[PDB]
C-alpha cells in the first residue's frame, strides 16, 4: 500500500517495533530500500510522539462480527492514543479474514508462549518464585476504528454485519 503511493508523492514514515520479537526492523529496512524516509522507535514513546502524526494505517489477524479486532500485542494502546487526539485510523485487510464469531469465549483468545523470550534461563534461583506471562494477541473494541479498506472499497464498521449475511449460512456457524 505504501510502496504504490510512494511512486508519485513524498512523505515520511514512522515505524514502531513490537518487542517480544523485534519485527519492525525488517519493515523499516524494506521501506528504506525503496527510497522513503523512515524512523525506528521503541514502544515506550508512542504517546509522546502522537502530536506530530497525521494518519495511522495498520493490518490485522482476524475481524470479528461486530467489528472488533484481533491484532498483535500493543495495538490497544496505539488505538487509545490515536483516539485521544482524534486522529483517523485505517485497517488494510482482505475478505478471507472475516469470521462469524463473537468475543465471548476468551481464555484461548490469546496465545501464550514460553517465558524464555522475556526472562533468560540464566537468572538462577530467582526463577523459582516468579511468574512470567507472555501473551501475543490483543483485543480491540470497534469504537476505535474509522474505516475498512478491502478489495471492493471502503466501508464503515457497521456495514460488516451485512457482509456476513451474504457470505455464510447461519446453519453452519458452529461446525
Amino acid at each position: 500500500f505504501l510502496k504504490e503511493a510512494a511512486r508519485k508523492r513524498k512523505f515520511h514514515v514512522i515505524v514502531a517495533e513490537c518487542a517480544p520479537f523485534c519485527q519492525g526492523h525488517e519493515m523499516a529496512v524494506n521501506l528504506s530500500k525503496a527510497g522513503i524516509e523512515t524512523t525506528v522507535m521503541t514502544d515506550a514513546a508512542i504517546f509522546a510522539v502522537m502530536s506530530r502524526v497525521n494518519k495511522v494505517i495498520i493490518g490485522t489477524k482476524t475481524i470479528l462480527a461486530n467489528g472488533a479486532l484481533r491484532a498483535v500485542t500493543g495495538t490497544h494502546t496505539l488505538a487509545l492514543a490515536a483516539k485521544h487526539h482524534s486522529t483517523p485510523l485505517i485497517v488494510c485487510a482482505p475478505m478471507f479474514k472475516l469470521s462469524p464469531q463473537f468475543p465471548n469465549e476468551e481464555d484461548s483468545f490469546h496465545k501464550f508462549v514460553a517465558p524464555e523470550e522475556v526472562l533468560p534461563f540464566t537468572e538462577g534461583d530467582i526463577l523459582e518464585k516468579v511468574s512470567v506471562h507472555c501473551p501475543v494477541f490483543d483485543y480491540v473494541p470497534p469504537e476505535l476504528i474509522t474505516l475498512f479498506i478491502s478489495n471492493i472499497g471502503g466501508n464503515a464498521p457497521s456495514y460488516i454485519y451485512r457482509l456476513m449475511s451474504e457470505l455464510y449460512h447461519p446453519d453452519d456457524h458452529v461446525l
Partner: protein
C-alpha cells in the same frame, strides 16, 4: 531526525582523558574520577549522583589555599565553574544537581571576609553535611510513614522501572505486617526493573514480571499504581522516564487510581506544555537486536534515509494523577505550586 535535531547527541565511547596531563592538571583529580564514572555509566540514579557530587565538592573544599590578597568569596566561585563545565561535557545534569549548585553558591557568597580560612572551611563542611542529612534521609522516612496508610491486605500494587524510594516504602510496609503482591513492568532499551525484582524476591514478597506492551492485559486485576518522579514543573506536570504517560493513560481508561511520590527539593520553575522539545537523547546503537542470525539495523549508517530515535524523558499532565505525597503530606496534583513555592 530533523524533529529532534536541536538536541545534541553524544556517544559513550569518547575518552576525554587522553589529552589530559597524568599527574594532576587544572581539573582537580576528584572531578576527573567522577566524570569518568559518569561517562562509563557506573553511577546511575537521580539521588546517588547528587550525593557523589557533594562528596567530591567537600573533598575539593578541604584542599584549598587563599590567594595572597584576593578574598576567597569570589575566588572559589570563579574557580568552581570550569570543573562543572567539564562535568556537563561528560553528561547532562539533572534538577537536583542544579538545586545543589544554587544552594552551594549562595552559601559561598554569604560568607564574611573577617573570618579565617579554617573557620570558613569547617563551616562549609558542616553546612554541606547538614544539607545532605536533612534533605534526603529524613524526607524519605517521613514519606514512607505517610504512605504506609494507603496499603491494605489483599491489595495488588503495580510498579514501573526502578526507584529507591518505592522499594524502601514497599519493604518497610511488608516488614510492618501487611500481605499483598506486586507486578513489575519493564521496557527494553535498558531493562532496569530487574533490580527491583531481585530486591523484592530477596525481601520475601511474591511478584510477577512482564513487558510494557502487555500492560492492558493485566490491568483488570490491579488496584493501585505507584510511581516516582524526577522533577516537578511549575504548572504541575510531572517529568519522568519515557513510558510513564502510557501507563497513566491506560490506568485512567481502566479506572485505576495513580499515586506519585517525590521529594520537595526537586521542584523546578520551568513551564512545558508537551512531551517533546526539552529532553535528552542517547546512543542510537543500543537499539540493535541480537536475535540469532537475523541482526537487522547493523551498519544502519549505510542507508541514507534510516534514522534511530532514543528519548529519555516524558512529561505527564496533571489531569492523569490523583495524589502527590511529599514530606509535608498528601495533596492533589493541581495544588503543587500553591504550597511548594508559596513560601517565597
Amino acid at each position: 531526525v530533523s524533529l529532534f535535531s536541536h538536541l545534541p547527541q553524544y556517544s559513550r565511547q569518547n575518552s576525554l582523558t587522553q589529552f589530559m596531563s597524568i599527574p594532576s592538571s587544572v581539573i582537580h583529580p576528584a572531578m576527573v574520577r567522577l566524570g569518568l564514572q559518569y561517562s562509563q555509566g557506573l553511577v546511575s540514579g537521580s539521588n546517588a549522583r547528587c550525593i557523589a557530587l557533594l562528596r567530591a565538592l567537600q573533598q575539593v573544599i578541604q584542599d584549598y589555599t587563599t590567594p595572597p590578597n584576593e578574598e576567597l568569596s569570589r575566588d572559589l566561585v570563579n574557580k568552581l565553574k570550569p570543573y562543572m563545565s567539564f562535568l556537563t561535557q561528560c553528561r547532562p545534569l539533572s534538577a537536583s544537581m542544579h538545586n545543589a549548585i544554587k544552594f552551594l553558591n549562595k552559601e559561598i557568597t554569604s560568607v564574611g571576609s573577617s573570618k579565617r580560612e579554617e573557620e570558613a572551611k569547617s563551616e562549609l563542611r558542616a553546612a554541606i553535611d547538614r544539607y545532605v542529612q536533612e534533605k534526603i534521609v529524613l524526607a524519605a522516612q517521613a514519606i514512607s510513614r505517610f504512605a504506609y496508610q494507603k496499603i491494605s491486605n489483599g491489595d495488588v500494587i503495580l510498579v514501573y522501572g526502578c526507584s529507591s524510594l518505592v522499594s524502601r516504602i514497599l519493604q518497610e510496609a511488608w516488614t510492618e505486617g501487611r500481605r499483598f503482591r506486586v507486578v513489575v513492568v519493564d521496557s527494553r532499551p535498558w531493562l532496569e526493573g530487574r533490580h527491583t525484582l531481585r530486591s523484592l524476591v530477596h525481601a520475601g514478597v511474591p511478584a510477577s514480571y512482564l513487558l510494557i506492551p502487555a500492560a492492558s492485559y493485566v490491568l483488570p486485576e490491579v488496584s493501585k499504581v505507584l510511581l516516582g518522579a524526577h522533577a516537578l514543573l511549575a504548572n504541575g506536570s510531572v517529568m519522568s522516564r519515557v513510558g510513564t504517560a502510557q501507563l497513566a493513560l491506560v490506568a485512567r481508561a481502566h479506572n485505576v487510581p495513580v499515586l506519585v511520590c517525590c521529594e520537595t527539593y526537586k521542584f523546578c520553575e520551568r513551564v512545558q506544555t508537551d512531551a517533546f522539545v526539552s529532553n535528552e537523547l542517547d546512543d542510537p546503537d543500543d537499539l540493535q537486536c541480537k536475535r540469532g542470525e537475523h541482526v537487522a539495523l547493523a551498519n544502519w549508517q549505510n542507508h541514507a534515509s534510516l534514522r534511530l530515535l532514543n528519548l529519555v524523558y516524558d512529561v505527564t499532565p496533571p489531569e492523569l494523577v490523583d495524589l502527590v505525597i511529599t514530606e509535608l503530606g498528601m495533596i492533589p496534583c493541581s495544588s503543587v505550586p500553591v504550597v511548594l513555592r508559596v513560601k517565597s
